[PDB]
Amino acid sequence: ADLEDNMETLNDNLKVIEKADNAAQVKDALTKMRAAALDAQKATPPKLEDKSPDSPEMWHFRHGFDILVGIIDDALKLANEGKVKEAQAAAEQLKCTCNHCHQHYR
Amino acid sequence: ADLEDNMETLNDNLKVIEKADNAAQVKDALTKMRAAALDAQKATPPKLEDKSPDSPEMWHFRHGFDILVGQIDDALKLANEGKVKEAQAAAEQLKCTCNHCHQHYR
Ligand code: HEC
Ligand code: HEC
């Protein structure tokens, strides 16, 4: 899937975690976000098409996805400890990363 | 590759980075550390061989490499900006992530 499908998947599962009528939907949703984030990390966004992969901007943009994937993997840890609210609160924390990247690169 | 070979790679290039002399050297050493860190992240560590790949311990273990990769990518931003002393400093702080995962999972 291209970059915007991944972003759509990230968007839809974030909402899933917020309304989780459970405790293992969190895990399920987080797994899909992990998959989407990782896959979106290999894509060059529109506003950096003409730039070098070695360019600081490309590493900065890739760093955002490292941080995001780290935040999800940590929430997957909390959710797999059965800590439903902390994992859901860790998922709220993710929007920092979404918005920091959108502000500079979308 | 096996986890032990990726760890030797991380150890050797961290040492190359500290012996310095140019941001181009740091950049190449960091490129190899990144490739090894991503592969190590796929391994199963001996101390966790008989626990679920979805256990919190395995998620904390994969989290460790998320943090490392993200730190490496930050240090590649600096090396590619030509800031060798800043990039070295950022590469020396990888040892915190090393030590921390070793304290738990080695
Ligand atoms: C960079 C490191 C990003 C992170 C982290 C996140 N997103 Fe993103 N997003 C990014 C780009 C470059 C773009 C635009 C790409 C393009 O092709 O123009 C987007 C776009 C979106 C969208 C719009 C979807 C669409 O138009 O089809 C959404 C809904 C979206 N992003 C959501 C989203 C969420 C919820 C994130 C964190 C949980 C997130 N993104 C992270 C770059 C980056
Ligand atoms: C977990 C998230 C780790 C991170 C991050 C780092 N290391 Fe590691 N290391 C880890 C394990 C589980 C092991 C045991 C390997 C095994 O197969 O049992 C290791 C081992 C090492 C070793 C010595 C073992 C060998 O290579 O034969 C070294 C020298 C080593 N690790 C170095 C190293 C460095 C320099 C790291 C970052 C700067 C680092 N490791 C990160 C787990 C994890």
Resolution of the solved structure (Å): 2.4
Pick left, alpha or beta for residue A3 (phi over 0 → left; psi -120 to 50 → alpha; otherwise beta): alpha
Q: What is the dihedral of CA B30, B36, B39, B40, to 10 degrees?
A: -110
Tokens of A82: 């059965």
Other Cβ atoms less than 10 A from the Cβ of A67: the count is 20
Does any CB of chain B come closer than 8 Å to the CB of residue A93?
Answer: no
**Spatial separation of the C-alpha atoms in residues B8 and B36, rounded to whole Å:** 9
CA B77/CA B38 separation, integer angstroms: 18
CA dihedral A96, A68, A60, A104 (to 10 degrees): -40
Cβ A63–B81 below 8 Å, yes or no? no
Amino acid, res. B102: H
Q: What was the experiment behind these coordinates? A: X-ray
Distances (CA, A) of B2 to A52, B34, B45, B49, B89: 32, 15, 10, 14, 28
Inform me whether the C-beta atom of residue A46 falls under 8 Å from chain B C-beta atoms: no
Torsion angle in degrees (nearest 10) through CA of A46, A100, B101, B61: -60
Q: Which amino acid type is present at position B13?
A: N
Check if B24 contacts A (Cβ < 8 Å).
Answer: no
CA B72/CA B14 separation, integer angstroms: 11
Of B105, B33, B41, nearest in space to B74 by CA: B33
The first and second tokens of residue B42, run together, are: 């796929």
- What is the distance in angstroms between the Cα of A80 and the nearest Cα belonging to chain B? 6
Structure tokens at A81: 């400890």
Atom of ligand 1 nearest to the CA of A63: 2
- The structure tokens listed for B66 are 């998320």
* Spatial separation of the C-alpha atoms in residues A13 and B83, rounded to whole Å: 39
Distance CA B92, CA B21 (A): 15
- Of the CA atoms within 13 Å of residue A84, those in its CB half-sphere come to 10
Residue B11 CA, closest ligand 2 atom number: 35
CB neighbour burial string for B71-101, b if at least 16 within 10 angstroms, e if fewer: bbbbbbbbbbeebbebbbebbeebeebbeeb
Cα–Cα distance, B40 to A102 (Å, whole number): 30
Calpha distance A73→A46 (Å, rounded)? 27
Cα–Cα dist A30/B12, whole Å: 35
**DSSP string for residues in B7-25:** HHHHHHHHHHHHH-S-HHH
What is the 3 state secondary structure string of B25-70? HHHHHHHHHHHHHHHHHHCCCHHHCCCCCCCHHHHHHHHHHHHHHH
Are A75 and A90 spatial neighbours (Cβ–Cβ below 8 Å)? yes
> Encoding tokens for residue A91?
């998922």
Name the token pair of B9: 């790679």
